[PDB]
Design a protein around this ligand. Structure first.
Ligand SMILES: *[C@@H]1O[C@H](CO)[C@@H](O)[C@H](O)[C@H]1NC(C)=O
Lengths: 48, 49, 49, 98
């Protein structure tokens, strides 16, 4: 139960924004060009 | 909209300007009004006046 | 799903049960002698005595 | 003013459509939803107000298609780590790959 709970919160922490505009990487790479996308990219990489 | 050179203040946060046709949006809220000349800065998220 | 894997153990459950069956048959056949040296056979009432 | 997905997607762009392919690893674009995976047949009976199915932790599991309304399943493409069995470079250079 402890391993499954840690695995479940490891999966579930992708849904957090960590200050970025969206949790999913693909739509923010689809809707921002890189020199202002990278501020959201750095926050997502830091949180994950 | 992008290729029209009559505008000078396209000025788009949120979705980036150069890749805009590729997403399929759900609700577009086309508001319209007329303002005083130096109030360009107050229509922006955060700047108050 | 997203790039996390669960590796299987080196010893499967049949092999762990074979290890415990070897331990069980060794203790009911020999007492404490197989854990020390060679397995020396015993009658089991004499082992419990 | 936009909102980015309070609703099903209604205002698309002028990009041309592409014919669909079954059971292959593709980079799909489902009304602005960009993702990777294979597109298989699904037996999940959706009620007619759904436009997409959503899995655990903000990943999309099943999408019904534009122009056809036929239900599709999104399974991710086959991945996994690679591993090397070696006897050591002192003995031989013959390599088993796991
Ligand atoms: C390589 O293996 C042989 C025999 O296994 C051994 O004698 C030799 O010392 C090994 N080479 C090194 C550099 O240890």
């Amino acid at each position: 139960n402890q391993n499954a709970q840690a695995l479940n919160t490891l999966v579930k922490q992708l849904s957090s924004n960590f200050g970025a505009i969206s949790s999913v990487l693909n739509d923010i790479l689809s809707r921002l060009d890189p020199p202002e996308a990278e501020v959201q990219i750095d926050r997502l990489i830091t949180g994950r | 909209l992008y290729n029209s050179a009559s505008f000078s203040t396209f000025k788009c946060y949120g979705v980036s300007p150069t890749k805009l046709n590729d997403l399929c949006f759900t609700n577009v809220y086309a508001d319209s009004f007329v303002i005083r000349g130096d109030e360009v800065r107050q229509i922006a998220p955060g700047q108050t006046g | 799903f997203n790039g996390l894997t669960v590796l299987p153990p080196l010893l499967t459950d049949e092999m762990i049960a074979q290890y415990t069956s070897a331990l069980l048959a060794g203790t009911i056949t020999s007492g404490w002698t197989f854990g020390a040296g060679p397995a020396l056979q015993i009658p089991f009432p004499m082992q419990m005595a | 003013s936009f909102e980015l997905l309070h609703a099903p997607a209604t205002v698309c762009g002028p990009k041309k459509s592409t014919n669909l392919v079954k059971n292959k690893c593709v980079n799909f674009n489902f009304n602005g939803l960009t993702g990777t995976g294979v597109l298989t047949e699904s037996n999940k009976k959706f009620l007619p107000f759904q436009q997409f199915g959503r899995d655990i932790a903000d990943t999309t599991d099943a999408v019904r298609d534009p122009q056809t309304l036929e239900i599709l399943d999104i399974t991710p493409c086959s991945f996994g780590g690679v591993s090397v069995i070696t006897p050591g470079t002192n003995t031989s250079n013959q390599v088993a790959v796991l």
